[PDB]
Swiss-Prot record, chain A:
Protein name per the record: Dynein heavy chain, cytoplasmic
Further remark: Present with 195 molecules/cell in log phase SD medium.
Subunit structure: The dynein complex consists of at least two heavy chains and a number of intermediate and light chains. Interacts with DYN3.
Compartments, record wording: Cytoplasm, Cytoskeleton
Family: Belongs to the dynein heavy chain family.
From Swiss-Prot, chain B:
Protein name as it appears in the record: Dynein heavy chain, cytoplasmic
Localization per record: Cytoplasm, Cytoskeleton
Misc. comment: Present with 195 molecules/cell in log phase SD medium.
Gene: DYN1
Protein source organism: Saccharomyces cerevisiae (strain ATCC 204508 / S288c)
Domain notes: Dynein heavy chains probably consist of an N-terminal stem (which binds cargo and interacts with other dynein components), and the head or motor domain. The motor contains six tandemly-linked AAA domains in the head, which form a ring. A stalk-like structure (formed by two of the coiled coil domains) protrudes between AAA 4 and AAA 5 and terminates in a microtubule-binding site. A seventh domain may also contribute to this ring; it is not clear whether the N-terminus or the C-terminus forms this extra domain.
Full protein: residues contained: 3380 to 3458 of 4092
From Swiss-Prot, chain C:
Signal peptide: none
Family: Belongs to the GST superfamily. Mu family.
Entry protein name: Glutathione S-transferase class-mu 26 kDa isozyme
Summary of subunit composition and partner proteins: Homodimer.
Lineage top rank: taxon: Eukaryota
Function summary: Conjugation of reduced glutathione to a wide number of exogenous and endogenous hydrophobic electrophiles.
Annotated positions binding glutathione: 6-7, 40-44, 53-54, 66-67
Misc: There are at least two isoenzymes of GST in S.japonicum.
GST N-terminal domain span: 1-80
Length: 313, 79, 80
């Protein structure tokens, strides 16, 4: 326990700070949200590990040059948190040492490798974190990175000269969707995904629908922006094309409400939950193609009347 | 043979060499890409085809490694 | 005057604070009021504590945060 009241109380102060970490585990472990609470735990973890790297400066083990109990506490914690993150210690080398030091005690090391030693779970089977029969698999680690990415989705929004606000930098989210969709397809090849698999099928249906609306929306954004140069601004051109400009403006109202409704949601994934979005955009792009096609018929019928116009472009 | 390996004694020995020893990655050279289908028939669903030239190569193989996919890389010249 | 930093609240200092007042031992507070989030973030960094947290107490070379480390200290300084 120590050689005196002082060294015994020193070892107990370490006990306290170690429990502020062993307990920190249990506080996020029972939650059904745990996979999303881990995020804030692993962010704080660095600041906590650091303090241990310092304690290990000018000392051989926690609480001194004669090895004390807190070092075996942190070793249990470490054993458990390395499963939660394999890279948690790499940023604190002096603790990675302290850890290997404990594990280096010949008798201890021989034990961990012995047959009576249980490789996993961490907690009682009932716990959310570290429960059940079998250690992760990675299937979990990847699916959690997917859900994390989709609750952080952000679109650069920039309004142009008139009313409507535009989405800049399409490709990045557009790419991410594709990549994460392909990841779920490769998860089907895995053996350990079977009932864990049902969830992925739900996430697959959510994202396949998100790429469905991703495709149509970029087309509308492009084709409207092109046609706005052509008819949205001048008086003279809209005078020549009456039914065309009256019908452009009617779609311009709809899309203005569709964007501002979708942008204020503040989650790109949340967009699939909006009523009739795939149907709306599919129909808008069809009408946008009819306007571009009608301009095309006018220009060529104009050109055919004074052939020179063929020269112009 | 059922997959569509040629009757030739040469091509039998070759397929033996490819399969039987895997302690090392095998490099299959064939002008007629009939061999890319042979391995596909053997592994079926598990068969994922990639190429050193395609863009998402870097990540797609990482998905292939994580969940036990059998991978064939279409352009071995470039590596 | 020896100093305890915390919210203007019982918070994590409450039993410790009582003990101190029991031994009529002198000290003062750095209190972050209800609309005073800034006052905390203002001292959050300058505390010289082995663990950042509130409360933090600093007196006779006793630099502490973490309710346990703190309380135990005062307690031990009196064999109590």
């Amino acid at each position: 326990l120590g050689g005196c009241p002082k060294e015994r109380a020193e070892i107990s102060m370490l006990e306290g700070a170690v429990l502020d970490i062993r307990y920190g585990v249990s506080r996020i472990a029972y939650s059904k949200d745990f996979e999303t609470l881990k995020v804030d735990f692993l962010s704080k973890l660095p600041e906590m590990l650091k303090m241990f790297e310092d304690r290990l400066c000018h000392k051989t083990y926690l609480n001194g040059d004669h090895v004390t109990h807190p070092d075996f506490m942190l070793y249990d914690a470490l054993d458990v948190v390395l499963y939660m993150d394999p890279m948690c210690l790499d940023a604190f080398p002096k603790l990675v040492c302290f850890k290997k030091r404990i594990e280096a005690i010949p008798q201890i090391d021989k034990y961990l490798k012995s047959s009576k030693y249980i490789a996993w779970p961490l907690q009682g089977w009932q716990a959310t974190f570290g429960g059940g029969d079998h250690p992760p698999f990675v299937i979990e680690k990847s699916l959690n990175r997917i859900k994390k990415f989709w609750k952080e989705a952000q679109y650069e929004v920039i309004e142009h000269s008139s009313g409507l606000k535009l989405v800049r930098e399409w490709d990045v989210l557009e790419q991410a969707c594709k990549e994460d969709l392909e990841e779920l397809v490769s998860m089907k090849a895995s053996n350990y995904y079977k009932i864990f698999e049902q969830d992925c099928l739900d996430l697959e249906s959510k994202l396949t629908k998100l790429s469905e609306i991703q495709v149509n929306w970029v087309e509308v954004q492009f084709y409207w922006l092109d046609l706005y140069g052509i008819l949205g601004e001048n008086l003279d051109i809209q005078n020549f094309l009456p039914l065309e400009t009256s019908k452009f403006k009617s779609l311009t109202s709809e899309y203005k409400m569709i964007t501002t409704r979708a942008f204020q949601l503040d989650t790109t994934i949340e967009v699939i939950h909006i009523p009739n979005f795939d149907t709306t955009l599919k129909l808008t792009i069809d009408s946008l193609k009819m306007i571009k096609s009608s301009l095309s018929t006018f220009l060529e019928r104009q050109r055919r009347q004074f052939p020179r116009f063929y020269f112009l472009g | 043979l059922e997959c569509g390996l040629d009757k030739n004694d040469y091509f039998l020995e070759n397929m033996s060499i490819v399969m039987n020893s895997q302690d090392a990655v095998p490099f299959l050279l064939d002008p007629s890409s009939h061999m890319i289908t042979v391995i596909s028939n053997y592994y079926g669903n598990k068969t994922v085809l990639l190429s050193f030239l395609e863009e998402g190569f870097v990540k797609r193989l990482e998905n292939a490694i994580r969940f036990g996919s059998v991978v064939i890389i279409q352009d071995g010249e470039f590596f | 005057s020896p100093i305890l930093g915390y919210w203007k609240i019982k918070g994590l200092v409450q039993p410790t604070r009582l003990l101190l007042e029991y031994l009529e031992e002198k000290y003062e507070e750095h209190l972050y009021e209800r609309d005073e989030g800034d006052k905390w973030r203002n001292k959050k960094f300058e505390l010289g504590l082995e663990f950042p947290n509130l409360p933090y107490y600093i007196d006779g070379d006793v630099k502490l945060t973490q309710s346990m480390a703190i309380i135990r200290y005062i307690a031990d300084k009196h064999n109590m």
